[PDB]
């Protein structure tokens, strides 16, 4: 059954969400409307948690779509578990390390940076466009 | 030129609801409104891909685009498993991994888009029109996957609002699908969602977006 | 003095989002040892008490209600959910963008929760309906997908993490 | 960069001598944010039937829904006089400020 | 002057290309009164090109004493604020014609394009008026895969007018259901457009108690009350 | 000149205001409060003897009013001073009750920033400026406007009545004023002759003679008969002129700007009435501005009409509000 | 009386509640309406002719309401219409990349 | 001389103005046709009296205006005035 | 021209599209139209500067001239420890036959973001009066300026005339 | 250019209905200076208050 909000509100009794009361409590004061339930701010403050959740996570799948090394370990990824299944102890080392050391150069090199070209793109989704350029002449 | 997939139109209309024999605009009206929902979708994945530094287009590259729906990319899941792993999923953000008549509504249900031959599908829809490369691996059986969804989706919100149409007009004074119901039914399914919509709401300019895909 | 900020700091989501964060973090590490395999085959855990200092928190400072220290917080709270995704290093203008996003979303809540209160219609929803109809016309289209995201983020992915840390332990067991 | 002090210029040319830092950076960002819109509205109507007909045609298109629209003294006036056609209403004469009624005013509500 | 440091690293393709702008670039004019002006005027299409008028003449279009009639009845059509209906297929025709004859299209306006027009104010107010419903009420049994009867008032739709502010042409439509919408209570607002006055408060005069009956003008404003 | 002078706002304080008894001050922030200060430390707990609970808040004499969702740009008291009205950037102006300190009306009329709410001189009804280019006259008990005042270029900056409540002056950024028949709603007059964003208006007790400063530091003084101009007035700096303010019995001009200056200036020297000067020197005169180390024209050059010039050492000045008995108040933030 | 059709095909009771409208709701919408047809047909008319025609077909209305408005109508014209360009930049532009990302690489 | 040439950069700075190339003006639809009605009512009725010519065309009978069937972009045009 | 960009800036744009070869016409008009409208956000943005009793403009004078002219929101001008000219103009040259500068940013963890302790607040605010004038002359307090120093410090076009009673 | 809009000014008050002697009279009117009104902030010996007549003001 779907949750009535009253159900909601009795959990967030129990339950904090992560952006703490002063944050709310400033964000209240900013744009008027004194309340002095301490829910309606918990439900609030777990309604904007989980809108930056999503714009978040819509972030994480534009990049890794858009770099070839993550598409590549998620094709490759029980083929080199194969190759690491087969690096057993020092005699059986010499048959692999034809393909290692270029993805390995390349995965352990790799971190996934959250990009002003990503999130622009992942919010242009949702309706903005942060057209920022990528040099200025 | 169009009208091309008329019969296969009527096939796949007959496996949502009934079929009475649809005219010739409604079957002209769908065929246009899928064609131009490939061309949206090649577009779109294109761009995707060309950006990775691919032109040819990959199969999850089109999963991409519908990445939402969960329950249908787990349909195509299914669809995918009688032929005899996402980039941006949860576990593929680390490095390494460990180790009568039945038959006839059935028959219905194995008639497909483009599952004879890609012949008559690669220069109606336009495939070598816009891809830069060759992307033929399996983004032409997705590209009939996802338009036997787009048809069976149409025509089932086709006929609930020809139905609540009749309840409205028995109402007001007191079988045929038309152009206006699939377009009612288009309006139905490219309306914007709200949580694409909220950080726009306050301030006031033009919302400009880009063709939902079924 | 405890400040009213690290009140809620141990209660019933942050614990959880810790406990998604550190378990991330540490299949993070396991994946770098076996890296290390394959290269021989040729950390800075968290803190949330932190608080601003005593002199601050006396009731002569507006230690609840200026720019920087929420501006702050919000930093924190929004890098301590950018990285439940498996986001580790970032671009500062992203998370400029990022927390200026989520304080334009949370203003137009209470503001449309405001423009709701309100209004000289001749039609004004109740307690609840106000807090209904303030959730859908910005965000979530029914109130039951919050508990759905607490069902997600922290009763899902905690065990999906949890069995990725048993399988890839059991695979270095393997291993050597 | 050369319109960094560009912009300087254009600044001090109407008496602006004290801004931030930021601000020829928001200037060129939204500059490039637009022109690329109107390359790309005209491209658009440019494949239709380039010129500059074609990127008047792309900033016709965008002017009448975002910035300040041209010489709009006439349908305020007309807008004015169709509300100064009501005469005032009476006023109390009790030399003070009197208040809507009750459920009018931000009292008779609840949380 | 003072700008030395400033002005000098520009280039000198720069500094040379700057040392010559200056007024009289153009062909424009900028006098609001005159924009205004030519934007309140009717105008009709009128020939001087031959070539122009050897197409013109070809294609069987009349000379501008049918376009002047042409403008004159897509005037006079009776606009969608009087009939208080939506406008059918002759008064989009008649007002879309006149509309091409004031742009400069002597040609024949299609017979699809009003009907692509009446779908696209279809969805147009179906837009604005179902982002005006979904604000008043909570419909639980949609939104959701598992009270009475309301009605939009004007102050409704002024304030989700403002709450989704997008969904407008953002011309006069939008600028009076901003300024003039919303009602004072001692309005008046069901009349005859003209008892708001100060006068009817103030007793019907009566006739003709007179040799010559010349009257006073208090007593005409109460003769056009009656029309 | 009393001066107050506001210290921990970090530039986030817009122009305040004074009461009338001069108890309450009022300051509208970047961050949607209005603060409000007793100006003689008083308790402003309005306790109304029952006294019933609640010495555990903390009052330091001052009180926060939130209700916008802007940025107040102005604020005006009523003469009865009972009652307080904050004009924002979010499309409302309110009221707040000075006695139980809450909101009690909002006020949504326009569609643009608000920047200039005034009150009647009698408190009957309040005129408002905005960036829409049209003043609105408005009344404390209807919620929507009851006339508008169009017919401006540029947006209205500065909104003043005359003394008698009869007519409606606005002053705006297309280098004019003009004067508002408060009941047929046309404009009356129309002042020409400025060269910047008319900033702040005021007219004087007599009623004959108008007076308006601009942004680039000049002071200039018509009359509302022959509408043209008597004589200007040239001593601020190249700068903006934040508030202007009467001399109750008399006139004498009091004009508190952003060059951290507060002037004294004489209405009635180079007019047909010469006010009485005395009747026999200094050495300060006419060389002050006779040094002119840095340039001749890179200097101002004050008219006959400028008397004294009280500087506030790197704090500006926002308000001047001439009280009854000889004596000014101004009114500013101390900025670093 | 077409307004209250037009309400009533978007406002059914479907189980949760009639929404009606009133009279002056029903003056604002048909003068928004009013306006809505004069200021698509205004820059319809413009872009047909910069197509150097004389004519007004419905590709013009079409073009005109899927670029701005998006209101993306089923096709009466809409593959004329729809015009596919990839929006990849030129080779300078890349080049200026290569350019930018080398100066990345070797900051580091 | 570096002088000369930073003094002509800012008197050149100082001489350009831009205008828009295609600004839309604010109006509507019936205060338009409310303005031509009634125009075209008081415009009829009378007379013009004229030194040689009236104004208006066919079923105008005012000030009309003259935009050629080419040139629909000019910013310009000539109207139509009683000429003696 | 005017002063924006013959095709330095301009052109930059039309390549990152993909436009290969426009007229010089074209890229004169559209970069005339684009500084009018730098100058149309610059007025509101100097409008909402002597509103706000300020004399600098800063970004969020010029990021509340974009919500009046309805253009969407600029993101990511205003960051932790918001001082006045919060210095950030680290534009890094790169060269060829023209000038090229890309803005450099260095990347960070999060965990040197989320384990990075609070700035300080400062005090509520609170004000403090004196005498300016008592007659007409200072009375020379501390709290009072020296009218000769006023001369070393500000010059007279932002300081105005010196006269004394 | 002021002698131009003085012309323009006669001529306009020509076509809008002012006698010669009346236009006169009028530009006359409108060059002398506001005289002085002794009362000016209505002292109260010969000043009265404003009427507390519920009505609105009407110049």
Not at chain 3, 61 to 89: C, P, Q
Not at chain 6, 215 to 242: C, S
Request: proline share 4%.
């Amino acid at each position: 059954k779907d949750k009535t909000l009253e159900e909601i509100l009795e959990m967030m009794d129990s339950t904090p969400p992560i952006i703490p009361d002063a944050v709310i409590d400033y964000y209240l004061t900013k744009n008027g409307f004194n309340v002095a339930d301490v829910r309606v701010k918990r439900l609030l403050a777990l309604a904007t948690q989980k809108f930056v959740s999503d714009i978040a996570k819509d972030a994480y799948e534009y990049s890794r779509i858009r770099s070839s090394v993550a598409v590549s370990n998620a094709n490759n990824s029980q083929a080199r578990a194969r190759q690491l299944l087969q690096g057993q102890q020092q005699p059986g080392v010499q048959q692999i390390s034809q393909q290692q050391h270029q993805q390995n150069e390349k995965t352990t090199a790799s971190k996934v940076v959250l990009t002003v070209n990503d999130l622009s793109s992942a919010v242009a989704e949702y309706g903005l466009n942060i057209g920022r350029p990528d040099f200025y002449r | 030129d169009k009208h091309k997939y008329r019969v296969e139109i009527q096939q796949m209309m007959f496996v949502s609801g009934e079929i009475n024999d649809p005219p010739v605009e409604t079957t002209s009206l769908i065929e246009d409104i899928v064609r131009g929902q490939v061309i949206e979708i090649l577009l779109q994945s294109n761009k995707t891909a060309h950006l990775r530094g691919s032109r040819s287009i990959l199969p999850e590259d089109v999963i991409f685009l519908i990445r939402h729906d969960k329950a249908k990319v787990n349909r195509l899941r299914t669809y995918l498993s009688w032929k005899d792993k996402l980039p941006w999923e949860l576990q593929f953000m680390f490095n390494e991994h460990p180790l009568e008549e039945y038959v006839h509504w059935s028959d219905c249900r194995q008639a497909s888009f483009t599952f004879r031959k890609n012949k008559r599908f690669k220069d109606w829809s336009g495939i070598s029109q816009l891809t830069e490369g060759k992307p033929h691996d399996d983004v032409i059986d997705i590209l009939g996957f996802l338009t036997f969804e787009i048809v069976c989706s149409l025509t089932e919100t086709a006929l609930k609002i020809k139905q609540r149409e009749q309840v409205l007009q028995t109402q007001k004074d007191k079988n045929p699908l038309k152009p206006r119901h699939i377009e009612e039914a288009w309006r139905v399914l490219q309306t914007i969602d709200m949580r694409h919509r909220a950080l726009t709401n306050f301030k006031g300019g033009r919302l400009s977006s880009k063709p939902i895909i079924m | 003095k405890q400040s009213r900020f690290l009140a809620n700091k141990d209660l019933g989501l942050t614990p959880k989002m810790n406990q998604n964060i550190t378990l991330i973090q540490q299949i993070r590490h396991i994946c770098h040892k076996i890296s290390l395999i394959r290269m021989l085959q040729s950390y800075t855990i968290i803190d949330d008490s932190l608080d601003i200092d005593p002199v601050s928190q006396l009731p002569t400072h507006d230690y609840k209600n200026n720019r920087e220290l929420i501006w702050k917080f919000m930093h924190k709270n929004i890098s301590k959910v950018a990285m439940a995704n498996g986001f580790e290093t970032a671009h500062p203008s992203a998370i400029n963008m990022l927390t200026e996003i989520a304080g334009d979303y949370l203003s137009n809540l209470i503001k449309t929760l405001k423009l709701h209160h309100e209004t000289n219609s001749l039609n004004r929803g109740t307690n609840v309906e106000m807090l209904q109809t303030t959730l859908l016309e910005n965000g979530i289209n029914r109130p039951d997908d919050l508990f759905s995201y607490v069902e997600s983020e922290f009763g899902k992915k905690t065990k999906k993490l949890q069995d990725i840390k048993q399988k890839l332990e059991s695979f270095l067991r393997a291993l050597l | 960069p050369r319109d960094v002090r560009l912009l300087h210029l254009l600044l001090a040319s109407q008496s602006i001598h004290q801004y931030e830092d930021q601000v020829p950076l928001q200037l060129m960002d939204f500059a490039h944010r637009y022109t690329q819109g109107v390359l790309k509205d005209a491209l658009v109507y440019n494949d239709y039937a380039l010129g500059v007909e074609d990127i008047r045609l792309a900033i016709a298109a965008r002017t009448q829904y975002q910035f300040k629209p041209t010489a709009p003294k006439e349908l305020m006036l007309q807008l004015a006089a169709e509300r100064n056609k009501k005469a005032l209403p009476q006023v109390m004469g009790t030399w003070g400020v009197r208040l809507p009624p009750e459920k009018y005013c931000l009292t008779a509500k609840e949380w | 002057y003072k700008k030395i440091v400033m002005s000098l690293p520009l280039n000198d393709r720069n500094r040379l290309k700057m040392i010559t702008k200056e007024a009289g670039k153009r062909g424009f004019i900028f006098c609001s009164v005159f924009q205004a002006r030519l934007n309140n005027i009717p105008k009709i299409p009128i020939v001087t090109n031959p070539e122009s008028l050897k197409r013109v003449k070809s294609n069987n279009l009349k000379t501008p004493l049918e376009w002047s009639q042409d403008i004159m009845n897509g005037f006079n059509v009776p606009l969608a604020s009087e009939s208080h209906s939506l406008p059918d297929t002759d008064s989009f025709y008649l007002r879309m014609v006149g509309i091409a004859r004031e742009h400069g299209l002597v040609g024949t306006v299609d017979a699809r394009c009003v009907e692509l027009i009446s779908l696209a104010l279809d969805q147009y107010l179906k837009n604005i008026i179902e982002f005006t419903i979904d604000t008043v009420r909570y419909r639980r049994k949609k939104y959701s895969d598992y009270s009475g009867l309301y009605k939009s008032v004007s102050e409704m739709a002024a304030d989700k007018r403002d709450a989704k502010i997008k969904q407008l042409d953002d011309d006069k439509n939008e600028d009076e259901c901003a300024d003039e919408a919303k009602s004072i209570n001692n309005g008046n607002n069901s009349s005859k457009d003209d008892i708001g006055d100060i006068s009817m408060s103030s007793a019907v005069n009566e006739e003709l108690h007179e040799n010559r009956t010349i009257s006073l003008t208090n007593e005409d404003i109460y003769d056009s009350l009656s029309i | 000149v009393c001066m107050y002078t506001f210290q921990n706002t970090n530039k986030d304080m817009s122009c305040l205001d004074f009461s009338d008894d001069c108890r309450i001050a009022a300051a509208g922030f970047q961050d949607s409060y209005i603060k409000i200060w007793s100006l003689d430390g008083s308790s402003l707990n309005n306790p109304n003897i029952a006294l019933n609970n609640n010495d555990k808040d903390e009052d330091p004499t001052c009180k926060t009013l939130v209700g916008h969702s802007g940025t107040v740009y102005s604020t005006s008291f009523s003469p009865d001073n009972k009652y307080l009205l904050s004009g924002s950037e979010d499309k409302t102006v309110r009221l707040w009750s000075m006695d139980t300190h809450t909101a009690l009306v909002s006020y949504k009329g326009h569609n643009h920033p608000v920047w200039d709410v005034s009150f009647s001189p009698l408190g009957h009804y309040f005129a408002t400026a905005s960036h829409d280019q049209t003043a609105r006259l408005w009344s404390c008990d209807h919620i929507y406007p009851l006339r508008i005042f169009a017919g401006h270029l540029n947006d209205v900056d500065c909104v003043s009545f005359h003394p008698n409540g009869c007519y409606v002056f606005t002053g705006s950024s297309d280098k004019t004023c003009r004067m508002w028949d408060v009941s047929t709603g046309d404009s009356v007059r129309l002042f020409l002759g400025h060269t910047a964003p008319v900033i702040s208006i005021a007219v004087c007790p007599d009623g004959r003679w108008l007076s308006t400063g601009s942004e680039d530091g000049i002071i200039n003084v018509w009359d509302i008969g022959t509408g043209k101009r008597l004589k200007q007035m040239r001593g601020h700096g190249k700068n903006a002129i934040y508030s202007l303010s009467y001399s109750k019995e008399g006139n004498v001009l009091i004009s508190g700007g952003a060059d951290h200056t507060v002037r004294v200036w004489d209405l009635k020297k180079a007019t047909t009435e010469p006010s009485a000067e005395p009747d026999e020197g200094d050495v300060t005169a006419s060389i002050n501005q006779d040094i002119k180390e840095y340039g001749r024209r890179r200097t101002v050059i004050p008219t006959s009409d400028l008397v004294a010039s009280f500087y506030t050492k790197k704090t500006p000045v926002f308000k001047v509000k001439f009280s009854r008995s000889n004596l000014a108040l101004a009114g500013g933030a101390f900025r670093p | 009386r077409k307004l209250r059709e037009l309400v009533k095909t978007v406002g059914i009771d479907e189980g949760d509640g009639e929404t009606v409208i009133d009279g002056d709701v029903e003056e604002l919408l048909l003068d928004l309406a009013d306006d809505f047809v004069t200021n698509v047909t205004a820059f319809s008319c413009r872009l047909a002719k910069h197509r150097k025609s004389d004519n007004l077909e419905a590709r013009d209305i079409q073009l005109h309401l899927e670029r701005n408005w998006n209101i993306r109508i089923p096709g009466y014209s809409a593959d004329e219409i729809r015009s596919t360009r990839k929006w990849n930049p030129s080779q300078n532009y890349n080049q200026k990349l290569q350019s930018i990302t080398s100066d990345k690489v070797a900051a580091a | 001389t570096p002088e000369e040439e930073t003094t002509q950069v800012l008197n050149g700075v100082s001489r350009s103005f831009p205008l828009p190339l295609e600004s839309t003006v604010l109006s509507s639809v019936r205060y338009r046709t409310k303005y031509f009605r009634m125009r075209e009512m008081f415009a009829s009725s009378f007379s013009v009296k004229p030194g040689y010519t009236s104004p208006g065309y066919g079923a105008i009978h005012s000030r009309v205006g003259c935009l050629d069937l080419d040139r629909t972009t000019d910013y310009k045009f000539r109207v139509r005035t009683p000429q003696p | 021209y005017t002063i924006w960009s013959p095709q330095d800036t301009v052109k930059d744009v039309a390549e990152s599209l993909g436009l290969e070869n426009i007229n010089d016409d074209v890229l004169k008009a559209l970069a005339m139209d684009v500084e009018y409208r730098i100058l149309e956000i610059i007025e509101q943005a100097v409008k909402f500067k002597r509103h706000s009793k300020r004399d600098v403009l800063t970004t969020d004078d010029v990021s509340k001239a974009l919500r009046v002219l309805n253009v969407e929101p600029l993101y990511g001008y205003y960051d932790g420890s918001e001082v006045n000219k919060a210095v950030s103009f680290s534009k890094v040259n790169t060269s060829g036959g023209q000038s090229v500068y890309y803005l450099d940013e260095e990347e960070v963890d999060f965990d040197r973001l989320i384990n990075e302790p609070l700035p300080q607040v400062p005090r509520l605010p609170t004000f403090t009066t004196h005498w300016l004038a008592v007659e007409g002359v200072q009375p020379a307090i501390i709290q009072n300026p020296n009218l000769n120093d006023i001369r070393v410090s500000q010059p007279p076009f932002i300081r105005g005339a010196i006269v004394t009673a | 250019s002021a002698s131009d809009l003085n012309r323009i000014v006669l001529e306009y008050l020509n076509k809008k209905g002012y006698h010669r002697t009346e236009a006169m009279l009028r530009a006359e009117s409108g060059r002398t200076l506001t005289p002085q009104n002794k009362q000016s902030p209505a002292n109260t010996k010969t000043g009265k208050f404003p009427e507390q007549s519920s009505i609105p003001p009407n110049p």
